[PDB]
Symmetry: D3
Subunit: 155 residues, 6 copies
């Protein structure tokens, strides 16, 4: 079926080895590039399967893990980005869509709007526009204004 298949079989003892390991020392080009024309699949599909029946066994595991590091010998830092997503021609699809058991839980749409299915938290302020609707969040401004308006009506 597949043009190239790379299989790492189960070793007797787990070890740190990979089926496929790629390294480039060329700062002028992507170490790896993929291009596909899928009608309804991912150009890259990554599946992580719990190696154990135990449902908490793989709690530190991930399908995709990214690290962003300084130059190994003597680097002063890095300003590289983690994930960069673009559509040079423009897309109508969701830029980031997160589902759990095939139900949408969080997404970022093509206009940069987000939708979250549950109560969330910002350890800081959220800057927003003034509400123009019932369930829009109220700014300090809107509160202060309805206050000052009611102070007046008591003279």
């Amino acid at each position: 079926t597949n043009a190239v298949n790379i299989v790492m079989r189960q070793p007797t003892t787990p070890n740190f080895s990979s089926a496929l390991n790629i390294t480039s020392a060329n700062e002028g080009g992507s170490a790896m590039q993929i291009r596909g024309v899928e009608k309804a699949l991912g150009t890259l599909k990554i599946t992580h399967e719990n190696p154990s029946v135990d449902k908490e066994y793989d709690e530190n595991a991930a399908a995709l893990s990214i690290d962003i590091v300084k130059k190994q010998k003597g680097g002063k830092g890095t300003a590289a980005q983690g994930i960069y997503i673009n559509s040079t021609s423009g897309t109508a699809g969701k830029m980031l869509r997160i589902r759990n058991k095939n139900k949408d839980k969080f997404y970022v749409g093509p206009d940069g709007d987000f939708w979250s299915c549950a109560s969330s938290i910002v350890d800081g302020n959220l800057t927003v526009k003034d509400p123009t609707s019932g369930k829009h969040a109220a700014t300090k401004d809107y509160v202060d204004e309805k206050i000052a308006e009611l102070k007046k009506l008591i003279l």
Copy 2:
């Protein structure tokens, strides 16, 4: 140009086959690893191209698709993560940057702050800090306080 090029040509009829398919049964190491030193590109770059001129044809497609599953025969669950992004040494760049037609739409910065370019939605509450600025969102606390303060001034 490239060290290794893998090409799957257009079949007469589309089928489920991949240019490159990797599977590891070793729970001790990443099935695949990539490392690059790009000055201005992605270490991995994934491009998805609509296979059709029709702009809605690829609405279920994605550049990157991730699935997180239990052990196939008899697993009780999984606690594996979807995408994990870190910078062990620390980065000044945006951890997640989403653009559409080369304009920023949503990002998560290195301090975990987010910026969204459009009206968004949480089906639940948002916990925030008290506003200290005009367009900061107001907490139940801030509202209740300006209320209690105005009750007093009417004795």
Copy 3:
């Protein structure tokens, strides 16, 4: 150690070439697929290293770069998604976890709740539920109600 290792050595002059370049013209299947059973690692791990000691040198670089494009000759658009994350069986782990120097900065949990470590911004409204707690953000509704309630008490 690794089953397959692909190395692109440092060229004398940087150029656009990749260690590994994959292209599929088959719209019926993922150009590439990866599956692993890691106990505590990423099924795919991508590391980007600053090629320079200079901490701002790689400011346009990324570990993962995604582009979503129309059909090259004559496409009218695309509705393809950037990143799609699912757990067909269901996971307890965070769907998106972003850390900087091994400290959590932003995440999206399995229920679609998000947590951000810093003040954030929406250029638009945020729709939320009515606050039921001190530091929950207040809706236009909650503000208007405590206003109308205080108007009444002044008759």
Copy 4:
């Protein structure tokens, strides 16, 4: 089973393309190297299968085809060898063993002796040592001597 499998499926029309194509421009190292420790198989095994039921269809085909050429732009020639076989430590096995339907037809042994199962031909002379046995081939010398010996006995 295999660590890496590369499959080129049957195209609708045959064309000149290969499953795997390797080119090196480095004159200092082998474009490819293979090493194995087989107990009873070839380190490399090549099978050619007639693509047709017709028994004469593949008469120009070969399992292994070697070409030895001059430098493409302006070379004056080459002195490169076709096949070089050595045993740096020394082997007791046949250096070249040729069988047809699992019966030996021709071989070259570890001392450089050959054995051929059928009448053969040299378009030229064969230089040999004087016969010391019935079915050894006779040199001009041996013939001339038995002649001169018989001339004498007729005085």
Copy 5:
């Protein structure tokens, strides 16, 4: 060092699996092609190493094993060749050179002459030209002639 390295580690029990397995179903092109520009090495180098200290353990093994077979389902035969060696531009080097412990044992030169280091055998006749030198092998013709010449001198 190498651009691509494929390693199959020692399994606990030997099995029939390969580091690299290639199959083409395209009758129009070589399943695999290699091209190099070595100054003093093989374009392909194959090393077989005895897996055992025992000097007779690998007596059925080979560095290169070739099989030439009919079409699997219903073929009537094949006329494919085993090894085909050419030099389209012409070479001064030996076409086949066989050494054991770095000493020449057998070769075929660029003119098709062979040299064998030991007594050899043809189960059949050898056709040769008439001897013109002492140690050239004698034809039936040369023998018969020196006979008829000596019959005459006895009248």
Copy 6:
């Protein structure tokens, strides 16, 4: 065109590195296997090109180089073969065909007969059958017999 292409570009200084390097430590299976269905090409085609215009520059080079070695740490020897060629079903084609500038110089046919285009040499005897034809080589037997026959006719 090709499913997998591996290219090692010209380095500034030649070094010992390969485009593709394969090693198996599994004594139970071929380190590599190739299978093709070519109508008129080699299942594997190896081309060596002189890296220099100088026609003697590559005099130690080869298209295919084979080494047969003992186990590295403490082996007592090896009985492995260099090249093993078979046709399990049987072939009508030449088992080994050697050409120089597209003219046949030496071959071994499917019955194990050889043909050489030039004067050749065996440092030893050649055992052959008695001549039954003019240009067949004469055995010690045939010579001795025509001698004894002529002794008789002189009584």
